[PDB]
Amino acid sequence: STVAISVQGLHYVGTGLAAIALAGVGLGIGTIFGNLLVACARQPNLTKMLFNYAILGFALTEAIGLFALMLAFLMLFS
Amino acid sequence: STVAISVQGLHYVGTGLAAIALAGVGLGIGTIFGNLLVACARQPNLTKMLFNYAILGFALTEAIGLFALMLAFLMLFS
Amino acid sequence: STVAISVQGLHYVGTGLAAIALAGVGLGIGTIFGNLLVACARQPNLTKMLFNYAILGFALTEAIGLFALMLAFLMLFS
Amino acid sequence: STVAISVQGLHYVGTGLAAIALAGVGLGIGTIFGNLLVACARQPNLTKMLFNYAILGFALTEAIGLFALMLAFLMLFS
Amino acid sequence: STVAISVQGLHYVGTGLAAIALAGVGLGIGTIFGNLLVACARQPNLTKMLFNYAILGFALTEAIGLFALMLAFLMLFS
Amino acid sequence: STVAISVQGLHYVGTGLAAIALAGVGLGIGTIFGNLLVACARQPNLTKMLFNYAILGFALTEAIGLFALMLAFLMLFS
Amino acid sequence: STVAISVQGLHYVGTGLAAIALAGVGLGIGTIFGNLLVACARQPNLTKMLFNYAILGFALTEAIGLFALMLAFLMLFS
Amino acid sequence: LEPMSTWYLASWAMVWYYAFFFWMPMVWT
Amino acid sequence: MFLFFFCDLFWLRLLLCMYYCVWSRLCFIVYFNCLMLIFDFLLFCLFDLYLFVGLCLFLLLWFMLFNLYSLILYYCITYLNLYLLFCIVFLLYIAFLFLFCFLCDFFLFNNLLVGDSFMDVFFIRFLLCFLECFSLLCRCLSTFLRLFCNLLSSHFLLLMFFDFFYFIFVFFFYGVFCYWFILFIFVFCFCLLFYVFLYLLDLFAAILQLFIFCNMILQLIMDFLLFLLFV
Amino acid sequence: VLFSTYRSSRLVSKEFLHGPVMRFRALGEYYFQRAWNGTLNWALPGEYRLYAVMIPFIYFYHRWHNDHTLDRDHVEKAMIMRWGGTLEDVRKLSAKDQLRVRCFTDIEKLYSAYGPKDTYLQPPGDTLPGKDFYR
Amino acid sequence: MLLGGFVPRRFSQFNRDPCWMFFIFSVGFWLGEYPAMMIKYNARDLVYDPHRYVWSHHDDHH
Amino acid sequence: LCNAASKVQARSAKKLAALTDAGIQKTISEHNANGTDAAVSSTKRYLAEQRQLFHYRVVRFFDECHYIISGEYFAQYTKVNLIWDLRFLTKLVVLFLIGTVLGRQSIFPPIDPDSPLVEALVTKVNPNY
Amino acid sequence: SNPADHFRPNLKALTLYAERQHYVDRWLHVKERWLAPWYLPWWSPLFQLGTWYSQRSRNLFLVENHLSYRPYKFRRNDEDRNNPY
Amino acid sequence: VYTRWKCDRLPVFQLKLFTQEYPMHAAVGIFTIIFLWKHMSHCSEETERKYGWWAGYPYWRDPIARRNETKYKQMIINNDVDITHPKWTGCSVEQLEELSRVV
Amino acid sequence: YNMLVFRDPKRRPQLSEEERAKVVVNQAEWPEEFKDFDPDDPYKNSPEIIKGMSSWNLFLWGVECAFIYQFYELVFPKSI
Ligand SMILES: CCCCCCCCCCCCCCCCCC(=O)OC[C@H](COP(=O)([O-])OCC(O)COP(=O)([O-])OC[C@@H](COC(=O)CCCCCCCCCCCCCCCCC)OC(=O)CCCCCCCCCCCCCCCCC)OC(=O)CCCCCCCCCCCCCCCCC
Ligand SMILES: CCCCCCCCCCCCCCCCCC(=O)OC[C@H](COP(=O)([O-])OCC(O)COP(=O)([O-])OC[C@@H](COC(=O)CCCCCCCCCCCCCCCCC)OC(=O)CCCCCCCCCCCCCCCCC)OC(=O)CCCCCCCCCCCCCCCCC
Ligand SMILES: CCCCCCCCCCCCCCCCCC(=O)OC[C@H](COP(=O)([O-])OCC(O)COP(=O)([O-])OC[C@@H](COC(=O)CCCCCCCCCCCCCCCCC)OC(=O)CCCCCCCCCCCCCCCCC)OC(=O)CCCCCCCCCCCCCCCCC
Ligand SMILES: CCCCCCCCCCCCCCCCCC(=O)OC[C@H](COP(=O)([O-])OCC(O)COP(=O)([O-])OC[C@@H](COC(=O)CCCCCCCCCCCCCCCCC)OC(=O)CCCCCCCCCCCCCCCCC)OC(=O)CCCCCCCCCCCCCCCCC
Ligand SMILES: CCCCCCCCCCCCCCCCCC(=O)OC[C@H](COP(=O)([O-])OCC[N+](C)(C)C)OC(=O)CCCCCCCCCCCCCCCCC
Ligand SMILES: CCCCCCCCCCCCCCCCCC(=O)OC[C@H](COP(=O)([O-])OCC[N+](C)(C)C)OC(=O)CCCCCCCCCCCCCCCCC
Ligand SMILES: CCCCCCCC/C=C/CCCCCCCC(=O)OC[C@H](COP(=O)(O)OCCN)OC(=O)CCCCCCC/C=C/CCCCCCCC
Ligand SMILES: CCCCCCCC/C=C\CCCCCCCC(=O)O[C@H](COC(=O)CCCCCCC/C=C/CCCCCCCC)COP(=O)(O)OCCN
């Protein structure tokens, strides 16, 4: 027989899964800054260019994480 | 007996799983920039040639993320 | 047939999944500090720049940690 | 008693799992480019040769992603 | 009481999990093609021998990839 | 009340999980060949003995893969 | 009301999970051999003492994999 | 969550638009 | 529907009027990089590269009057809505983007086609160009989303911790007089330490997020600036 | 010709309200116009006393507003819903009863998510009125 | 920016400046409102509302 | 258990020696030489002085009452007196509230038998309290 | 829930409602009154700015032929996904 | 010497600032305001009941019903609307009288 | 010293040791407020703003205000 079911609570589980994508974002940010300190330790005079590129990398990485948040909030309110 | 069941909330769970793909993309981008920082500190004179290849990497890695997002949007709105 | 189901305890499951994101955050902090010690070892004089950049990044990784924690509380207290 | 059940929302879950394979692909690509920058910063005169090999690696890891994408599509439309 | 149940959609779930095996396989290839660039820069005279070994490693990793791919397809069309 | 249930489709799920272990094997292969190239560049004179040891590493790592694969196939047909 | 339920196919799921434990075991063995090649390249005269220690590490790592494998087979036959 | 709401978004944004068009000149001068 | 409400800055407006009726020097600026775009001398730009200074300063002042003072209990961030922040970032980002586009210099976009002639135009360079043109809008969205969510999450955490602290302080202080007073003292010291840590973290992050909100816009501007050399 | 666009077109005399304005400026300048009062983007001054004075005042007036205008709505809603669902029904009670109810509401607020759940979950077998008491 | 200003060395000096006098009064209010809440909300004669199960915010927002 | 006691004693000794009050140091030295307790002696001296100053307090009270009633106090009224009076009023109010609470021996007003809250009294978890 | 309720504006004073038809009609009357006088020719840029875009939008609306149903903009209840009416 | 900020009055300086200093920003702001008031300026009754009240909708007095009642009464009285017309009721006046006598 | 996050500013020395040693200190000319001046407690002798108003008195005043704020309704309750 055909049965159609609509569970309210399944919109929570999907949301939590999307948050896990943040784990690959936080680590990625830590990797950039970890390399920044070494790069500054190796070519300290060049701190500015390294710092700017670190911000650029941080910005791009955060953008990806937010897309996960966009889905997380879309499902949480759906 | 034959029983066909259609759980709506399941389309949320699949979406959350796809978002996890962003964890690899986010980490991969940070790894590229992490190498870029040290790469420039080694040879600051090449802060242009190296930069071109880095953003090439960001675009190639972000391309995979589009598929992950596309699947999420192709299942969240389905 | 139309069936509407409302599962109560599912919100707990989503809460735990979001907490997993902190695994990629706490590790990310360790990576930054791990690089900090090495950088300070080979550039003791330039400890000021390295320590400041470590704490700046720690806040840009803690943000992502706060991102997940908010969703956890939303799915735990609502 | 014999009971046969056909859940038509499970194909969503399988699709999301396949997308997780992309996490190991996008990250792999970033690793190649990360080492490329270091390789270029060491022997820039060999960049034209290293870049071709870097593209070759991307052509293989991306091919693996297609297989995961194929499954993500077959189940998402079947 | 004896109850026999046959869930049909579960064959999709097993297919998705096997696809995750490719995550390590794709990442493993990136490692080979990552170290290859570093090795080539140090010893550009040995590009041919290193390139052959890299192909050897890629073939070995791809073998496991097909093993997982075989399981995924078998559980998909079964 | 006593209820005994026999789900036929669960064997698919267990099979997929056993395939995931292949990722830990496939990635391990890349690591051995990732460092083999570096060792060859470092000490080209030992291109033979290192290659034999790398093959041994593949054998031991591959043997673990087959042990996991045996469980994957046993549950697929039982 | 008191209800006792006995699900049969669950042992397949538990067994598959134990198989994943071999992922780290396979990766760990590959790591040992990878470092072995570099160590041999660095100190080519110590091609036997290093080999003996690598075997010892593999034996210990294999024992951990065997511990998990015992549970994997035991549950599969319970 | 009101922060995620849109049933009175226009009136809510009027605060920012007033700040930008009418208070920024005063703070400027 | 027309809703009439008021911002939560009236006291701060009064203080600004009282304290700034007379001139005073400003030397500490949250985002100082908007005043020094060129670091190599003899480089000059014909584009109005210093147009962003006034907006940057006003935005810093406004967001500081709101966010920093929001730590005080019961203080309200009147503008805290996702779509309102979207409107703000849209205004700024799209205004600068349309300033660059109205210049009617198509060559300015040549750098969008990433890479060199040696890469396939249709299958490599063009795809990357599409991805980068997408990345611009993604940068706008990311700026606004980050600004919204940092505040929301931090204040949620602060409210939860304060609720826990109130609960334990009110309903378990009697343990000071009991034999298990040591456990309560340890918990109270832990709570005080966490309270201080949270306040410091929020104070630093509020200012860092404004640094980054203005830095994204300045980066957008810099991505299309060309400097001539004096001769 | 009708209105001047220049600020120099004065509308009042230079000495209009000179005394009060000078007192106001004296109040403004005594603490702010100092070397150590170096503001950060005009928002965060350097004078410690400014923080010490303004933080308590801001908290006080915000808390007064919240207690007497915002939380009062929730308290009144609870009183109405739990004691008849109409304002007249609540007013039928004495001031002491209303005090008891409002203090119980404060108890619930303080408990929140860490307090015992019997304050809103009726244990089985409890003799107290249920949700359908007034229905 | 926290550059300067009067800084009392200890509690006894908080009366040496009007601003710090107001500050210590505010701190007294802050810290003394807690014991008052302890006494008021843990009193023996405090009684839970009999109709507390008639309605609750949990059912309303749910 | 012993090292901590020694450390506390040493810290107290250091602080006691740190103070530069001639009278306090002189009293401490005298009591140490005599082996007596300075703090207890100070307490007894204060109690004796208060016992001998009771009627002085009464006379001062009457003098202050005359000063206030005569209107001379308000003739020289200043802002400082206003601050003191506000403090005095606050203490009066808080004392009145505390006195009411103690008088009825309950933080909250007692519940009348006709009130609908009597059920709460009936449903006490622990009737003893 | 309760923590979420703390993020609302705290100085709401008044709310006014007005149907789109009513104030649109009033605006049209104002525009007609100000664009009617003879000393503003129809070919002037101001008159065209006032009228042409509105005419174009209304014409686009009239020509619309959509196979799907667009629920009324100002229904009493629009929170139900399974009831467009 | 002449300077816009020091010599011009506030309205004039505002116009100059948003016409010859930040004209694109003002244009985009007006565009966004128009969009917001064209597509985000409506709230249904159900939406107001769900989220439009601080502590919740007081169903025990239904203020929305009273508001609508006052609106409709004012409209009817001012515009002289005959609510008994057949279009409003779907039946003739005589049929309405018959129904009234029946019920 | 510090009071929470508020740190007391310290004047940098300007005189060299040689010049400093030749300076003759005469506290008789110093104001009564600053005699036996101690950098670690410069305001020990500073006069009170209000005579007889101690810091503890203000703290107790605040505590009493809090108690009133919390207990006034308990003695003078008002109807809704
Ligand atoms: C029907 C009921 C009544 C209501 C009718 C409403 C009609 C609406 C029509 C339809 C509108 C649709 C669209 C609505 C969108 C709303 C969006 C919105 O609100 O967003 C939030 C947003 C919040 O902004 P914000 O960040 O809070 O800042 C705005 C503030 O004004 C602060 O910003 P600011 O400080 O930057 O502003 C500059 C400020 C600079 O600072 C100042 O000037 C300081 C003063 C500030 C005043 C303004 C703040 C108001 C504070 C609250 C109210 C004060 C007390 C009022 C007491 C009322 C008692 C009943 O200068 C001024 O404000 C200039 C005015 C000064 C007036 C001085 C008058 C002195 C009189 C002295 C008389 C002496 C007589 C002596 C006789 C002696 C005889 C012997 O609102 C706005 O941006 C403004 C929205 C306004 C939209 C236009 C509305 C139409 C005009 C209505 C006028 C009604 C007049 C009649 C009322 C009669 C009493 C009932
Ligand atoms: C429901 C209604 C029920 C009604 C029941 C009936 C009510 C009573 C009716 C009448 C009954 C008959 C009369 C009985 C009178 C008995 C009292 C009496 O005469 O006392 C005089 C007697 C001295 O007479 P004396 O020897 O002739 O004096 C000769 C000179 O005048 C000496 O002159 P001085 O210069 O020495 O003057 C100062 C002296 C005199 O001052 C006084 O007179 C004090 C006030 C006297 C009345 C006390 C009544 C107490 C009744 C029970 C509690 C009620 C609340 C009391 C509030 C007091 C606030 C000050 O101060 C003291 O007595 C100091 C005592 C406190 C010492 C604190 C030291 C703590 C060290 C802790 C170290 C821990 C280290 C652990 C390391 C572990 C490592 C493993 O003093 C006492 O007995 C003091 C008793 C104090 C007990 C306090 C208990 C508090 C609750 C427990 C603590 C919970 C919180 C903290 C826990 C922390 C964690 C452990
Ligand atoms: C040579 C002659 C010598 C004569 C000697 C005479 C000596 C004896 C004294 C004479 C008598 C007093 C004279 C006036 C003194 C005024 C105070 C003063 O001294 O100010 C300093 C100063 C003294 O002059 P000055 O420094 O020598 O020269 C000024 C500079 O040249 C230029 O200044 P500026 O450009 O730098 O700045 C002007 C203005 C910027 O320019 C404007 O604001 C002008 C334009 C404003 C337009 C606003 C309305 C727009 C509405 C929309 C458009 C409607 C179009 C309608 C079209 C037709 C429709 C049919 O700046 C401001 O807005 C900031 C200052 C605001 C002051 C604060 C106002 C609120 C105070 C509230 C106190 C009381 C609170 C309540 C107490 C309650 C107690 C229970 O004067 C001013 O700052 C003027 C401020 C004017 C503000 C007007 C705001 C009006 C708002 C209400 C409108 C109501 C409309 C109702 C419509 C109803 C329809 C149904
Ligand atoms: C006598 C005045 C002039 C009369 C007319 C003269 C001849 C024609 C002039 C040009 C006409 C342009 C026609 C449209 C061109 C293309 C744009 C477009 O698509 O427009 C859509 C629509 C026009 O409809 P339509 O397409 O032509 O045909 C009807 C459609 O069927 C409707 O279809 P729909 O679906 O689009 O309908 C939705 C809704 C859509 O409506 C909206 O979205 C309304 C948008 C309003 C935009 C306002 C622009 C200016 C903003 C300045 C900065 C404000 C900062 C924030 C301040 C907040 C606090 C106040 O449409 C309407 O209901 C239109 C009503 C428009 C009323 C405009 C009232 C402006 C009030 C400004 C108040 C400023 C207060 C400052 C106080 C400061 C005190 C110190 O809205 C507009 O055009 C809005 C702009 C209108 C500008 C008029 C000229 C300037 C303002 C003159 C009046 C000033 C009154 C001041 C009162 C002060 C009280 C204190
Ligand atoms: C540049 C950096 C600046 C750092 C400033 C550091 C400030 C250090 C403050 C120390 C503690 C102060 C306690 C004050 C207590 C007030 C009374 C009270 O009860 O409050 C309790 C309140 C709340 O305490 P609570 O939450 O325990 O209250 C309990 C009440 N119940 C139980 C009912 C819920 O304390 C606070 O929230 C104070 C937090 C202050 C955080 C720092 C704010 C800095 C930003 C604002 C600066 C403003 C400067 C303006 C200058 C002029 C500008 C033109
Ligand atoms: C709970 C649900 C939540 C959903 C959330 C969804 C996200 C909401 C986000 C809102 C906040 C952020 C807003 C950012 C800005 C968005 C802007 C946008 O898309 O608006 C487009 C909209 C589209 O307008 P429109 O909707 O009127 O389009 C009409 C099109 N027809 C007639 C076919 C239906 O623009 C406006 O609202 C402004 C229009 C007027 C201003 C422009 C006039 C000039 C137009 C020039 C071209 C045409 C005329 C010819 C040339 C000129 C001749 C004189
Ligand atoms: C332009 C009007 C033409 C018709 C004649 C109308 C006369 C009405 C009777 C007016 C009597 C009172 C006049 C008082 C002096 C007005 C001075 C004036 O206009 O100054 C504007 C002055 C601001 O000047 P500034 O920009 O600072 O610098 C000016 C120097 N360039 O404005 C003000 O302060 C407001 C003064 C308002 C005064 C009243 C004006 C009334 C005008 C009504 C016109 C409509 C017709 C009236 C007919 C009335 C028949 C009985
Ligand atoms: C007329 C007043 C007399 C005062 C004498 C006080 C003597 C107290 C001695 C014993 C104290 C410990 C008792 C332990 C058990 C307490 C249990 C409890 O809370 O019971 C309350 C009694 O609790 C109170 O009301 C008092 C709460 C705490 C009061 C705090 C007083 C002021 C503290 C100021 C703190 C400031 C900081 C000082 C720090 C010092 C240590 C570091 C009564 O209600 P119950 O019937 O038990 O249950 C109610 C359920 N419906």
Numbering used by the authors:
A (entry chain T1), B (entry chain U1), C (entry chain S1), D (entry chain V1), E (entry chain W1), F (entry chain X1), ...: 41 to 118
H (entry chain c): 29 to 57
I (entry chain a): 1 to 231
J (entry chain f): 2 to 136
K (entry chain r): 1 to 62
L (entry chain m): 16 to 144
M (entry chain q): 14 to 98
N (entry chain i): 2 to 104
Give sentences copied directly from the paper behind this entry.
Mitochondrial ATP synthase consists of the soluble F1 and membrane-bound Fo subcomplexes and occurs in dimers that assemble into oligomers to induce the formation of inner-membrane folds, called cristae.
To describe the conformational space of the T. brucei ATP synthase, we resolved ten distinct rotary substates, which were refined to 3.5–4.3 Å resolution. Within the four classes of the state 2 the rotor advances by 23° and F1 returns close to its position observed in class 1a, where it is found also in the only observed class of the state 3.
